[PDB]
Write a protein that binds this ligand. Structure first.
Ligand SMILES: CCCC/N=C1\SC[C@@H]2[C@H](O)[C@H](O)[C@@H](O)CN12
Ligand SMILES: CCCC/N=C1\SC[C@@H]2[C@H](O)[C@H](O)[C@@H](O)CN12
Ligand SMILES: *[C@@H]1O[C@H](CO)[C@@H](O)[C@H](O)[C@H]1NC(C)=O
Ligand SMILES: *[C@@H]1O[C@H](CO)[C@@H](O)[C@H](O)[C@H]1NC(C)=O
Ligand SMILES: *[C@@H]1O[C@H](CO)[C@@H](O)[C@H](O)[C@H]1NC(C)=O
Ligand SMILES: *[C@@H]1O[C@H](CO)[C@@H](O)[C@H](O)[C@H]1NC(C)=O
Ligand SMILES: *[C@@H]1O[C@H](CO)[C@@H](O)[C@H](O)[C@H]1NC(C)=O
Ligand SMILES: *[C@@H]1O[C@H](CO)[C@@H](O)[C@H](O)[C@H]1NC(C)=O
Ligand SMILES: *[C@@H]1O[C@H](CO)[C@@H](O)[C@H](O)[C@H]1NC(C)=O
Ligand SMILES: *[C@@H]1O[C@H](CO)[C@@H](O)[C@H](O)[C@H]1NC(C)=O
Ligand SMILES: [Cl-]
Ligand SMILES: [Cl-]
Lengths: 605, 603
């Protein structure tokens, strides 16, 4: 009979009748390839952590209603087994909203099919979908609970709900009731909120243990006093002790000094507090998983976060400083620590233009377009992530430049505009709502719209994406749209159909191959890809979508490439989808190339 | 159909009727685990080499008569097809004597069963053994010739024969005849000797192409002028251009500066000479494969050689420098070069005593000992390598010290002496032929004798090993010997039976685990023995070689990652011959350390 409880008498957790507090670290399995799960978790163990903390991103597991992903990189059950097999406990945060700088705070976009849906509330359609999701996830989690033989000792309900406007306690009670129904009555359910009564007011519920979060800028006493007002008895707990912070495209890379993270950790542990380090390893937002803040500002591909373990898992000075702090309070495992992976500079690889996006419509959109009088959003058109192409015809001569505009700022989030195959420039959420175009009457007007990530925090998480309101040309509404959802991922894996089915440039796909020798024990190795001369786009290697590149804005110039997707003898295919300007016109092909280097640059100008 | 030949007209090789010259590096397959063969060869090719050169050690392939090893790490034929797949041609050096800083110059010790054998002569017993070895080896090499679809372009007969005192021409002519019988008439046969007439006098033969060796200290013009006297026509060839040099236990680590090598190389290459860099990667003398020079000094376990590729295959400054030289004459292949392997410091691993050698004789010698009136040699007693225990019984009292001596300097090469389980000290070839001992009449006198490696060069390659002449106690010859051959290798693999001032020589064992499911572990490492003295080390039953931190210059030994596991603990076994740091109450001193950088040049 295994037991994990709160002992309200003694301000403490009890683990099999024994006093316990946790020193945890956040790691997000959706942000580290499965190939490296064990590497990271073992490094986390060797730092002295006795638990880990992770989020379960609903959209990561049910990308359409009733279609589930629980295998490979999506195998949350396996990750939790690994943790347990390494002797770590787990703090599970299954949301259903997780925030986490992740697309729509983990909520699936298809929830937006009800336009007026009020997310994170007792809205009956939101509740019904949550309910069906918990019916699938929580039963899987039940045998992973501590009391049933597994590593899960506490579960978070929601995430900083007190920061949300709605303040719907019926919603929180419903969550509590359904977590209870699927996981039983002994399991420790908790909440996390900012450490101030204004946040705690709407976030705390009777029956859910109130924990707070704060970083190195906060007064510890004040933060835990704010916790004690809601829970006068029980353990002190900082569920997110910030070791670093998040980034946005175009802003400097966020760092937090090692000495400051170490001194706050020492003082938090000295109080007998349980603490989780957010992040311990941050990892990567592969594909289109990044989130955004409002006013619209997208987080980038790297989730390095200045964490103690770097994006690719390296042991940094920070890791060792925090290990040393922990050694002052708890016995740290003996033995050598698994190393930083070796990184290899594969060098310059040339690419060549295969096809424009305009030319690849047949393969990108093989069931054809949707026809509409006014524009439809991504959601109406059954696409959640990536790119949709909006096509109409110009109803007047525009031999003199005419203004193409979205009067209500409804280009969510960026559009690459062409007229009869001539690039016209870009429309941008917030920044540029009007662009001048030229072309003859009856010319084809194309806007390729990119979803740069659904807002994950604040009131505007109901971020539909696409052309969400009308376009005007010379102030008149443009009607009669032909809208192509783009299956970029399939198209890239079939080499735009080539492998069958067993100043601006036009958005287009560029491809090249590089080989790596077999029989070399230490190849392939992790690497970092860099795009000098390129501008904005998406990159795949062998069909694995490594994410978004934007050296024009920074701060991230390199993208992390993990070794297990690279092959030997067989050619590695790099596919770049460049959206704005490619270095490939001039008859210097050596300019049409990318470069693999051995050090990250996530912290430049 | 493919042709390779010397055209005496254009002073050139012709490959498929076209001028050809080679820029080669030496790599010895016997000194690099097979696990890394491709890695070292690929790195060689990315330096701009169009060929490699190697030695076939006879003793590596025929450890007893009629008993062959051509599998796994001993798979020469594989090594050569691998080089071919990579687009490298091969210059093959099959000896039978190869020198090479290798045990008896490649010659098998069982040749010494005929005590009086004159090695490397027309001694008819020596020839009949060689002939049977050629008849097994050269039909294996025949399809690997260039003319038959293979990589092999030239073949060396013997090795610096002109440096050998015997000067037996009939021997060379026999080799020539037998090589032509097995490989056919078209293959380019050549000899290699030092670049001076006194060395070429007994080395060159009619019908074998005469080549020379020399390093950076030599006048390149004079060197090739000496070849030209022997061969007025044909390509110039330096078959061993020294990139570095050999070591001996107890002497400073040899090094040769990159700049000097670069200079001579460019110079040799601009003359249109074919050249081979000796070594390109040197690797390791695992187990007991090192050799020795006369007067007796052994070469160490490491065969780094200050090569362009380090012991563990690392890309050095010297590698990049020679590659930049080769680039000036031949476009070098494109792509990134395979990297230096990652190295991991596994840290300190504690060991504990298992059994002294004395107490392990059941498992080390399961056939019982041999009795003999006087002492017998390693060869007489049917053991070639490692250790043999010679035991007698004190015939008079020695309460006051008494001289135990080898008057003729017959301890070959080092003896670890104990009387009644009490270590007395050490007798050493050429250095200490007398040692004072104590004990009662009837006390057991034990000498653990170590073959430190048979001399690979000079007159004294007939190096039998053991007690090769009598011992005296208080001037009287000791007699009535109980001699135990020791199966150290078997016994270590079975954990000394567990798995079916000085200290007494003893085995110490301990364990370390490496986690599974970590993509970049295990990795290569280097093992170090601080506080230990002299001994042999195995990991998971693989004999990595000899350690001797008390003499240097080599303090670490290379551990290749592929012998390390993650499914079960790894087992380290040390056999410490002189002094183990394992008596004191601090058991944490009885330990070895794994580090990520080699130390092969301690002072
Ligand atoms: C300034 C308001 C804080 C909004 N919350 C943030 S920003 C960084 C972190 C993660 O997003 C996270 O998943 C939140 O719980 C806390 N948080
Ligand atoms: C002046 C001493 C020369 C003895 N010859 C040597 S020592 C280093 C090298 C290798 O042994 C080698 O295999 C010889 O051919 C040349 N040589
Ligand atoms: C924190 O606030 C407490 C009072 O609650 C006070 O004692 C202390 O000075 C404060 N520390 C900091 C760093 O603001
Ligand atoms: C578009 O063109 C008009 C000139 O007709 C000009 O007044 C305006 O600045 C231009 N708009 C943009 C967005 O460049
Ligand atoms: C576009 O235009 C008309 C107003 O004429 C309006 O009826 C419709 O709601 C608008 N649609 C969108 C998506 O803005
Ligand atoms: C890249 O790889 C595949 C073949 O494996 C092929 O479709 C494409 O044609 C290749 N291009 C080059 C230069 O190898
Ligand atoms: C080599 O000898 C020749 C004379 O044969 C002399 O001209 C030359 O300088 C010498 N070269 C070197 C490098 O000493
Ligand atoms: C001890 O050995 C030394 C040198 O071998 C010798 O001179 C001395 O006589 C020995 N001891 C005695 C008791 O003589
Ligand atoms: C040892 O000495 C004896 C007696 O003089 C002699 O028979 C024999 O040749 C010697 N044996 C060796 C191996 O020296
Ligand atoms: C393995 O090594 C460990 C050292 O921690 C030792 O305690 C144990 O006895 C060893 N096991 C075996 C099977 O030798
Ligand atoms: Cl987390
Ligand atoms: Cl060689």
């Amino acid at each position: 009979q295994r037991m994990f409880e709160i002992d309200y008498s003694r301000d403490s957790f009890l683990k099999d009748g024994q006093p316990f507090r946790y020193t945890s670290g956040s790691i997000h399995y959706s942000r580290v390839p499965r190939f490296y799960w064990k590497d990271r978790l073992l490094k986390m163990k060797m730092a002295g952590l006795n638990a880990i903390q992770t989020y379960v991103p609903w959209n990561f597991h049910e990308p359409w209603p009733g279609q589930y992903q629980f295998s490979e990189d999506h195998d949350v059950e396996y990750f939790l087994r690994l943790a347990h097999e390494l002797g770590l406990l787990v703090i599970l945060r299954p949301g259903p909203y997780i925030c986490a700088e992740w697309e729509m705070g983990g909520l699936p976009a298809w929830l937006l099919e009800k336009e007026s849906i009020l997310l994170r509330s007792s809205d009956p359609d939101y509740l019904a979908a949550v309910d069906k999701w918990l019916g699938v996830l929580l039963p899987k989690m039940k045998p992973l609970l501590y009391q049933n033989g597994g590593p899960v000792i506490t579960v978070q309900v929601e995430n900083e709900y007190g920061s949300y406007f709605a303040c719907d306690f019926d919603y929180l009670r419903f969550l509590q009731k359904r977590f209870r129904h699927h996981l039983g009555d002994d399991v420790v359910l908790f909440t996390t909120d900012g450490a101030h009564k204004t946040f705690l007011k709407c976030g705390a519920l009777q029956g859910l243990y109130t924990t707070v979060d704060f970083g190195t800028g906060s007064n510890i006493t004040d933060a835990f006093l704010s916790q004690r007002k809601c829970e006068p008895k029980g353990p002190l707990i900082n569920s997110e002790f910030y070791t670093g912070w998040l980034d946005h495209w175009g802003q400097p890379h966020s760092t937090i000094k090692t000495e400051a993270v170490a001194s706050s950790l020492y003082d938090i542990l000295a109080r007998g507090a349980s603490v989780n380090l957010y992040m311990f390893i941050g990892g990567t937002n592969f594909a289109y998983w990044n989130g955004a803040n409002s006013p619209y500002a997208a987080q980038p591909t790297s989730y390095d976060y200045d964490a103690p373990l770097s994006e690719a898992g390296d042991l940094t000075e920070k890791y060792f400083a925090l290990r040393n702090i922990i050694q002052k309070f708890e016995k740290v495992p003996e033995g050598p620590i698994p190393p930083s992976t070796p990184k290899f500079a594969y060098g310059k690889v040339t690419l060549e233009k295969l096809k424009t996006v305009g030319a690849a419509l047949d393969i990108l959109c093989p069931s054809g377009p949707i026809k509409s009088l006014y524009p439809l959003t991504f959601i109406q058109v059954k696409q959640h992530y990536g790119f949709v192409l909006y096509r109409t015809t110009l109803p007047q001569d525009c031999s003199n430049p005419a203004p193409l505009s979205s009067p209500l700022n409804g280009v969510h989030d960026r559009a690459y505009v062409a007229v009869d195959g001539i690039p016209q420039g870009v429309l941008e959420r917030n920044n540029v709502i009007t662009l001048n175009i030229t072309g003859k009457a009856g010319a084809t007007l194309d806007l390729l719209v990119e979803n740069m990530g659904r807002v994950n925090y604040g009131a505007y998480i109901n971020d539909f994406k696409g052309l969400v309101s009308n376009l005007t040309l010379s102030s008149n509404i443009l009607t009669d749209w032909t809208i192509f959802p783009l299956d970029t991922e399939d198209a890239v894996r079939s080499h735009l159909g080539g492998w069958g089915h067993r100043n601006y440039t036009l958005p287009a796909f560029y491809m090249g191959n590089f080989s790596i020798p077999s029989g070399i024990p230490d190849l392939p190795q992790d690497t970092f890809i860099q795009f000098p001369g390129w501008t904005k786009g998406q990159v795949w290697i062998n069909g694995f979508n490594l994410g978004r590149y934007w050296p024009a804005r920074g701060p991230q110039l390199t993208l992390f490439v993990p070794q297990h997707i690279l092959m030997t003898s067989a050619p590695n295919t790099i596919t770049v989808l460049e959206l704005e300007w490619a270095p490939c016109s001039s008859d210097d092909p050596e300019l049409c190339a990318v470069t693999f280097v051995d050090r990250p640059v996530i912290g430049s100008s």
